[PDB]
Structures are given as C-alpha cells and as structure tokens.
Amino acid sequence: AKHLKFIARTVMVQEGNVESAYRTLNRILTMDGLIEDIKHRRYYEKPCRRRQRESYERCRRIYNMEMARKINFLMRKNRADPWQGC
Amino acid sequence: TKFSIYPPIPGEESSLRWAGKKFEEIPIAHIKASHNNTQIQVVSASNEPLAFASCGTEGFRNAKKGTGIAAQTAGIAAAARAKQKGVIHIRVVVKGLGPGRLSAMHGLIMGGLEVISITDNTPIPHXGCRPRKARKL
Amino acid sequence: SNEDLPISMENPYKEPLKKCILCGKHVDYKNVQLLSQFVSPFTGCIYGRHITGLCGKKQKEITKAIKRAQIMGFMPVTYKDPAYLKDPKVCNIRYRE
Amino acid sequence: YHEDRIRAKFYSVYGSGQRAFDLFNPNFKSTCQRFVEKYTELQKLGETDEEKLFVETGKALLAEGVILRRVG
Amino acid sequence: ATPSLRGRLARFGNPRKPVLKPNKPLILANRVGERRREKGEATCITEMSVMMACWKQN
Amino acid sequence: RQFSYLIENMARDCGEYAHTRYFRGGMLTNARLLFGPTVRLPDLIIFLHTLNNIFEPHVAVRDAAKMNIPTVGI
Amino acid sequence: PRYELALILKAMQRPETAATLKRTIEALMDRGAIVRDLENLGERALPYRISAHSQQHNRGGYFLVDFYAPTAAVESMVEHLSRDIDVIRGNIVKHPLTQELKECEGIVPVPLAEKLYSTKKR
Amino acid sequence: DPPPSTLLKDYQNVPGIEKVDDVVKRLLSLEMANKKEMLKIKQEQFMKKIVANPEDTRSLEARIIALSVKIRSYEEHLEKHRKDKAHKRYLLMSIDQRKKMLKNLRNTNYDVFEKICWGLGIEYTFPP
Amino acid sequence: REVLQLQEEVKNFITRENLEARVEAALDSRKNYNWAITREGLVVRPQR
Amino acid sequence: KNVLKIRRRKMNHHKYRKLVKKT
RNA sequence: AAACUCCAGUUGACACAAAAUAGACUACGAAAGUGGCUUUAACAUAUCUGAACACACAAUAGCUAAGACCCAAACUGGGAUUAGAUACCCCACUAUGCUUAGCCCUAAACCUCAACAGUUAAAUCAACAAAACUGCUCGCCAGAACACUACGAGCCACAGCUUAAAACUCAAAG
Ligand code: FES
Ligand SMILES: [K+]
Ligand SMILES: [K+]
Ligand SMILES: [K+]
Ligand SMILES: [Mg+2]
Ligand SMILES: [Mg+2]
Ligand SMILES: [Mg+2]
Ligand SMILES: [Mg+2]
Ligand SMILES: [Mg+2]
Ligand SMILES: [Mg+2]
Ligand SMILES: [Mg+2]
Ligand SMILES: [Mg+2]
Ligand SMILES: [Mg+2]
Ligand SMILES: [Mg+2]
Ligand SMILES: [Mg+2]
Ligand SMILES: [Mg+2]
Ligand SMILES: [Mg+2]
Ligand SMILES: [Mg+2]
Ligand SMILES: [Mg+2]
Ligand SMILES: [Mg+2]
C-alpha cells in the first residue's frame, strides 16, 4: 500500500515468451513460500493444528533428507556385477 | 545487453522502450483471479479505466465462471475493448490463485495485446484478519 | 622399554573450525547494503540459514537488524531495494533454474 | 607420534609434494618423512625452538636439491 | 545439512518439552515410495476454444 | 565373492571342502534330511570371512555351535 | 547510559534543517543528556511512504545523535519527538557500540543424534 | 538511596577521579547508570556497616545482605507493576529464602544474627 | 585507561557553546554505514 | 489405547448435566 | 439457492484488531505460557527433599461492570441437503475473542514418565512405548461398575469447584 509498485514479484517477459515468464514467477513464489502460505491462509488453521503440521513437515524433511543422503552414498555401487558367476 | 528480469526502476534512466513509451507509461491489466470468477480491468498508466471484462459479463453463470475457458473468454473481451482505445502493450498485475490466473493472460494475448511484464499482488497478511473457519468435508 | 609406542596428544592434523562470512564483523541495522544481501530480491523475505549459510548467532543478528531497519524507516519490507541488486551474491539460491 | 606435529606443519606449509606415495614399497620415504628425519636430526644438536628449527630444516633440504614449493 | 535431532524428541535425558512428535519412529526403511502417476489434465482446451468460437461466428 | 574362486581352489588342492555359495537354511542342523541319514558332517569349519553380504554374522557360525563343531575364523 | 537517536527529518532547506537539529539537541540537553556527536547520513528517498502529522513524506534527512542520558530521559524525549512536526520518525536505541562483540572461534559441528530408539528387533 | 552523584563502584577507587572534569564525573556517576548499578552501592554500604569482613561475600551474613537488597528492589518494582505476577513470586520466594538464612544464622552465630537484624531492620518471626 | 580515554573524548562533545557550529559542520559532512560482504568474507566498502 | 473408559465417563457427565438442568 | 446490487474493480486517505518470511533455529519462564519494533524495570536460593487445604500463580471457556469493534463466531434466522437434519455445506448477525477493574480456579493442565544424586556392568529385558537400573525423599495406588455421583465441609463460586463414600449388582473389567 505504501511501498512503490511494480518492484515486488514483478518479472519481465523475454521475446514475448509469456509461458516461460509465468513459470519463472510461479517458481519464485513457490521457492519463497508464498504459494503455500496463501493456500493455508484461506481457512483458519487453529494453533494446535498448525503445530501438528509443522512437526509433521519437519519430521518429513529430516527423513527425506537422510534417505537422499543414503541414495547418493550408495549410487556408486550400481555398477555391473564384477564377480559375475560367484 | 543481457535481459534483466528485474523491471526498470521508474527514477533511473533506461533504454527499454515499447512503441516509444517508457515502462512507467504502459497501461496496466489488473487481473483478479478468484476461486469462482476472474475479473480483468485494463487501466491507463494514469489510472483511467479503459476496458473491463469478467467471466460473469461474458455469459458464464454459477460454477462455469470458475474455469480456464471462461477466464480466457474474458481476456479476449477485455483485449478487444482495450485495443479500440489504443492499448497495445500491457503490464499484467494478477492477484489470486484462481483457475483463471493463467488463462486470463492467454485470452489477453489471443486478443492482440502484448504482455511486457507479469506482477503478483496477491494479498498476504503479515499476521491481519482471522480467516473463516475450516470446512468440514 | 620401547620408544615406538604411541604417545597421547590432541589431533595435530585437526583443521581450524569453519567461520561464517560474518564472523567477527558488526551487524548494524543502519548498514542496509549488507542486510539487503540476505533478503529475497522479489518478496523481501528473509532467507533462512540453509540459504545464507550464516551461523546461528549471526542469523539472529541479521534477522533482528532487518526487522529494526524496516520499522525505523531504513529498509523496505516487500522487496529488495533495487539499488542493492548488483551487490555480491552470497546466498545459495537458484531462482532462474 | 611426536613426529605427527612436524608432519602436520610440513603438509600445511608445503602440502603433499608432486612425488607420489608408493605404499607397495615397505621402505618408501616421502619428502615429508625426509623432512621429519632431518628435522629430528637438527633437534639433537640442541635447538629448542620450533620456528627457527623448522626454518633451518627447509634450508638443509634446498641445499641437497629437494624442491620445496610453499603454498604461497 | 540435515536438521538436528539432539533434544528434539521426548526422552528421559531431554529436560525440555519435545520439539518433534513423530507418529512413526525416525528410522530409515529399506524401501522408497513408488513413482506416482501424473494426474491427468484435459488437453487441447485452447484449440477446442478457437474452433468452437469460429463455429459460433460462422 | 571376490575370493570365492581362490577359496574353492585352495580346498580342492588340499583335499578338503569349500562352501562359498549361498548358505541354504539347514545345511548343518538338517543335514540328515538334506544329504541323507548317514552323512558325516564336518569336523572343523574354517571361516575365512565370518560376515555375510549384509555385514551380519554368517549363519553357519551359529549353526556350527549348535552342532558342536569347532570353528576357526578370521 | 549511552543511546542513539535515529532521526528521520522532513526534507527541508538548510536553514530549517539546522533549526530542527538545534531544537532537537537542546531538548536532549534539557532532559539531562550529554550529546556526544551528530552524524549526517544524507537525504534519501524513504523506503516507503510515511504519513506523519497529516503529511505524506517521500524523502527525509537521516541524522544520528549519540548522547548519554539518564534512563528516565528516554521516555520523556520520545514524547517530545512525537509532537515535533518536522520529525518524520524518531527512534531511540541503546547505542550499538556499547555492546562489545563477543569473540567467536567458529562453527562447532553437531553429529547425528544417536540412541534415540532401542536396539531391539522390530 | 545513594545520591545520584555517587560514583560507580568500579570507578570510586581509580586514582585521580576527584580531579576529572565535571562532565566526566557525571558520566561515571549513578545518575547516568541503570538501576542495578545503584543496588551494588547499597550492598557495599550495608556490607561495611554490618559485616566484620566486608570482602567475604560467601558468609551467611553477606548472603543475607545481598538478598535483602534484591528484596527491596522487588518491592520497588512491584509498587509500579502491581499486576506483575512473575516478580511477585520472586519477592515471596526471596523473603522465604532470607527467613531460612536467618534461621540458620540464629542457630549458629547469635551474636551476628542480632547485628543483621539491627543493621537491616529485620524483625525475626517464628513460623506458625 | 578507560577514564583517561573518556577524558580525551569528552573534549569533542557537543556543548551549548559549539552547538550551532557543530550543526553546520554536520550538514556539510556525510557518514556512510553501508558495506557489503563477499563469499570470501571480505568487506567491500562503497565507492562514492 | 481405546477411549472406551472415557466414553463411559463422557456419558455419565452428559446425563448428569442434563439432570441438573431439568431439576 | 438465498443474499447483495448503497454492488464490484482501479487509485488515494485510513485501527483499542491480529502479528508473513526469519524458524531446517530449539531458546525464555515455576508451570500456564512466550516468536512485529523500541525503551524502562527484571528472571529467588552456595546441600537436597518438603502441602487438594497454608501462601502465590494457573490455557480456553464463563461471570460482574465500563469501553473498542476490522475480522472470526456459539446461539438465532434464511437457503440447500435429507425419510427426518434441531447437523455436516452456503449467507447473515449476536454473546464471545480485545482494553480497563474484579471474579471464577477447570483441561488429554499429558512430554499420561515426580524432585535430587549417580550408573551403563550384571538378570538388559513379560508385551508395546521413549533401553535397563541404583541411592534417597515426598505424593499417590490396592477387582469392575455404582462415581468427575450422594451426604458433610470449605469457597466472591449459588445449574459451580475442591474433597469424596455406601447399599444393591457382577466374574469379570482392564
Ligand atoms: S562462526 Fe563465528 S560468528 Fe559465525
Ligand atoms: K509480523
Ligand atoms: K487442583
Ligand atoms: K499429551
Ligand atoms: Mg500414535
Ligand atoms: Mg453410566
Ligand atoms: Mg438468488
Ligand atoms: Mg523445597
Ligand atoms: Mg497432604
Ligand atoms: Mg484462569
Ligand atoms: Mg473474558
Ligand atoms: Mg463478519
Ligand atoms: Mg461483539
Ligand atoms: Mg500444554
Ligand atoms: Mg516432589
Ligand atoms: Mg538425573
Ligand atoms: Mg470435572
Ligand atoms: Mg459434585
Ligand atoms: Mg458424608
Ligand atoms: Mg452439597
């Protein structure tokens, strides 16, 4: 309301490529957390349900970030069987 | 020069022109993408209404306004009325995550308007009014 | 006895502890150029430490300095001041890909 | 071991030389070990300071023809 | 880096209130989830729209 | 499995026996059914590797103790 | 103790800006303050539109006043600045340099938490 | 209350502070310090007036004096903040702790217990 | 040492005698608190 | 654990409050 | 569908309301609680344990009186659904959520794991859960149901809270 307009969340179109520009803007809003904030703000999330979701989202990150660290650690052993026949 | 996604600052001097008009002078297409309707108002850079079209004014009723095709039809209608008043290049400012968020801009492009930027003004309260209670579905 | 038995020391090869880029530097709310390096260019959102890479002590200092500068009339809230868009990029975030 | 202190400083100041470790040879002597052996020899003389003793060791090797390119 | 788990769970050593309340024990399973089928979307709405609009005109 | 061929040769050369393959359940504790009533079990079992291919103790270590067979193991 | 007054003044001509700064410094001294230094940070475009005293300001002069004052002076000085029509925004903070920067050795790494669940078979 | 001109406990014994400029003297005085700095001076005055060794801070006497200064600071805080429930608890706990300290001093050193009660104006009361 | 430093610093404090002169001097000068950090932890002061 | 013990107590309290209101 | 059309969109002005991001941090407080900014005051105890009742506190809801009112919202009204719909869905609006001054004193107030001091070796160990124990102290528990009940007593509470049984019944309850 007070801030200057056409500076925040504004993206310029390159060579009339609106699709690529919209995808870029949507990705900026996603990677900052705006899209997920807007959807959660439509209805009131009561404080107890918000804490239960944060705890769920936090435990999933940990598990998902530890599984991925193991996948990249074992990807080296996807090579062909070197002792084929034993 | 490398393309800058960042818009030209109004105060500083820029070489980017569209039909001899600076970024601060291009008319603005305000798109309100709600869950049930899409409203498009094209205004001049000096805040003078030029064209208005919504899914409701295009003959869609009830749940049929909240569709991509309905928003696209509103875009084409707004573009037609805006192009009569001399609008070619438009700065799109869309607020809301409704079904017609992207379709409305396609309609505007299909109608002969050129989009030079895409801004998001979706209102996000930083803490604000308590929203309605969750639906039991 | 024998002279070749291992002796008790502290790991002589131990590397020095890693320091955040702001370790030992004063974070002032007036220094908006520095503070702008840790906010989103599009939304003005404060980046988390997983993006900034700052230690816990400096992440708090930067957060508190931004919130002070913003309400005291030094820093914008909804976007990064366009003047500081060309400063050295120190945050590990990829927006265009 | 006592010499690990010397080895650590050598690797920090000079780094692993281009000479490659041959671990198959049970009697291989790396440039670092050569430094340790010389440094340990100069300590027997009676030098009680590391800085001076360390600097003197490097000079002895340069006289013998060893290439000691510091990281700097 | 993975978020820390020191003092996060309700354990006898932990004096503080629990940060995390995992329904399932935080222990990596020996399987990964299946690949999810992409939810289908209606294709060719734009091309359908232009054909139907011209029909109306002609 | 890097040493299955080497070990199987060493056994044949010294007139002894090697089992470097997947150890099927009951080879030692159910031998009379698997091999025959008059089968003679090993008197010594030498484990050149005591872990299986999931880094856990080879089942035969437990089974040798059940059958009172002394075991040598690296 | 030591404080810092971050004073955003209305964009005025030099004679009026000098009077306001004198007015402000004299108010500090009248309430028992010892003014240490005055720093001019320059006239800048305000980050956002500030409405003050029935005026909309888009530019302001940023000034800093370093002063020592009794603890009771702070509440009084804030009230004075509220009523000055040439001050867009005034905030008194404990001087940033009274707090001595603590010495940091670096980031101490924290390993994966262990023994969170029993080692029984599941 | 210590006059506002009283120099801070840290600078009262630095040599030559009586000859520094008046501006420097009021910058190192209680007027320009927080409330906690004036409480350190109150403690020193009680310690010198009552305790045999004003430098022994680990005796039951010094600890009763230090806690009594905190009790008074809580009573003054609560006179302005009458609905501060956290500090009302700190006051009531501090009063109970001093009663336990006074009971222990009365049981061990009665001659010094009388000097604590006189100097600090504490009237010992037997529990119900 | 702290008292001595303060006594030297108290000489250049604003008083009612030098107030007007010190206000004019402040209006002429500029003090910039802005500086940027790099990925290497080096301060890049502003060039203006 | 199931909430069968709570459910018995839930009904007892409900019927008690209704009785107190009625009389 | 009702509702609204004194409506909606753009722009400017504009709170006694609620506090994105930071927070992948895990800190403060006795607990309840505490996450916009600033300043003031300020976070008991140099052995530990020590109360349904003494003393001081204690989410939300509620009561008493006076204010504020964006939004949300029991109740209530309307629309729709339905065999019915005193609900679930839609719209409207009130008590209420906020401020000031007094009450009320409850919670799945639960991290259902008491305070303090130690230990990881033996039997580690019913099962599950969040591995198993030692010293010491206080509190509490002895089949289910009757029963967060009756009576008595206390309480600013008067359809309340705290304490809290028995008879009859059962061979299970868990
Ligand atoms: S690691 Fe030293 S302050 Fe960040
Ligand atoms: K906020
Ligand atoms: K109770
Ligand atoms: K619980
Ligand atoms: Mg569960
Ligand atoms: Mg019943
Ligand atoms: Mg209707
Ligand atoms: Mg106790
Ligand atoms: Mg009792
Ligand atoms: Mg209460
Ligand atoms: Mg109330
Ligand atoms: Mg409403
Ligand atoms: Mg109301
Ligand atoms: Mg709780
Ligand atoms: Mg206890
Ligand atoms: Mg313990
Ligand atoms: Mg009850
Ligand atoms: Mg009762
Ligand atoms: Mg009775
Ligand atoms: Mg009764």
Q: What is the CA radius of gyration of chain I?
A: 17
Strand-pair category, B89-95 with B49-54: unpaired
CA distances from F47 to C37, D61, F58 (A): 62, 51, 9
Query: Token digits for C79?
Result: 């976007």
Tell me which chain B residues have a C-beta less than 8 angstroms from the C-beta of A33. Answer: none
CA distance F37 to C67: 85
Task: State phi, psi for H103 to the nearest 5 degrees.
Answer: -60, -40
Size of the H and I interface in Cβ pairs below 8 Å = 17
Please answer whether residues B130 and A44 qualify as being in contact, where contact means their C-beta atoms are separated by less than 8 angstroms. yes
The structure tokens 């061990």 sit at H108
Residues in contact with ligand 1 by the CB-under-6-Å rule are C 19-20, 23, 55, 57-58; G 104, 106-107
Phi-psi region of F50 (alpha: psi -120 to 50; beta: other; left: phi over 0): alpha
Distance H93 CA to K57 C1' (A): 13
Phi-psi region of G21 (alpha: psi -120 to 50; beta: other; left: phi over 0): alpha
Query: Which residues lie below 8 Å from residue A43, measured CB to CB, with a gap of 6+?
Result: B131, B132, B133, B134, B135
Query: Which residues lie below 8 Å from residue H49, measured CB to CB, with a gap of 6+?
Result: H119
Q: What is the DSSP code (8-state) at residue I10?
A: G
CA distance I39 to C91: 9
Phi-psi region of C64 (alpha: psi -120 to 50; beta: other; left: phi over 0): alpha
CA distance E5 to E17: 14
Query: Å resolution of this model?
Result: 3.0
Contact partners for chain E, using 3 or more CB pairs closer than 8 A, are A, B, G
CA distance B80 to B112: 8
Domains (ranges, CATH) in chain G? 2-94 (3.30.70.60)
- Helix (H) or strand (E) segment spanning residue A32: helix A18-32
Query: Token digits for F54?
Result: 């999931």
- Helix (H) or strand (E) segment spanning residue D11: helix D2-13
SS (H, E, C) H33-98: CCHHHHHHHHHHHHHHHHCCCCCCCCCHHHHHHHHHHHHHHHHHHHHHCCCCHHHHHHHHHHHHHH
CA distances from D62 to D47, D56, G115, I17 (A): 20, 10, 54, 70
Distance B70 CA to K84 C1' (A): 40
CA distance E25 to A59: 10
For ligand 1, what atom is nearest to the CA of residue C17? 1
CA distance B73 to B107: 6
Reduced to 3 states, what is the DSSP secondary structure of residue F61?
A: helix
Task: State phi, psi for H62 to the nearest 5 degrees.
Answer: -60, -35
Query: Which residues lie below 8 Å from residue H105, measured CB to CB, with a gap of 6+?
Result: H60, H61, H64, H112, H113, H116
Contact partners for chain F, using 3 or more CB pairs closer than 8 A, are A
The span from the first CA to the last CA of chain F, in angstroms, equals 16
Query: Token digits for D33?
Result: 């070990």
CA A70 and chain centroid, separation: 20
CA distance I2 to A63: 55
HSE-up of residue G49 (Cα within 13 Å, Cβ side): 9
Tell me which chain D residues have a C-beta less than 8 angstroms from the C-beta of C6. Answer: 1
b (16+ CB within 10 A) / e for G4-36: bbbbbbbbeeeeebbebbeebbebbbebbbbbb
Query: Which residues lie below 8 Å from residue G24, measured CB to CB, with a gap of 6+?
Result: G5, G7, G65, G81, G84, G87
CA distance A19 to A27: 12
Distance J10 CA to K173 C1' (A): 18
Q: Is A10 exposed, middle or buried (0-12, 13-18, 19+ CB in 10 A)?
A: buried
Q: Is B7 exposed, middle or buried (0-12, 13-18, 19+ CB in 10 A)?
A: buried
- Indicate the top mutation candidate among C57, C59, C63, C90 to test ligand 1's pocket, ranked by most ligand atoms within 8 A of CB: C57
Please answer whether residues C60 and C22 qualify as being in contact, where contact means their C-beta atoms are separated by less than 8 angstroms. no
Query: Token digits for B64?
Result: 């049929």
Strands in B38-43's sheet, in edge-to-edge order, are: A10-12, B114-120, B89-95, B28-33, B38-43, B49-54
Tell me which chain A residues have a C-beta less than 8 angstroms from the C-beta of B97. Answer: 35, 38-39
CA distance G65 to I19: 12
Please answer whether residues F37 and F1 qualify as being in contact, where contact means their C-beta atoms are separated by less than 8 angstroms. no
Positive or negative, the Cα torsion across C78, C81, C84, C86? positive
Chains E and I physically touch (3 or more Cβ atom pairs below 8 Å):
no
Within G71-115, residue ranges assigned H as helices are: 71-83
CA distance G37 to G27: 15
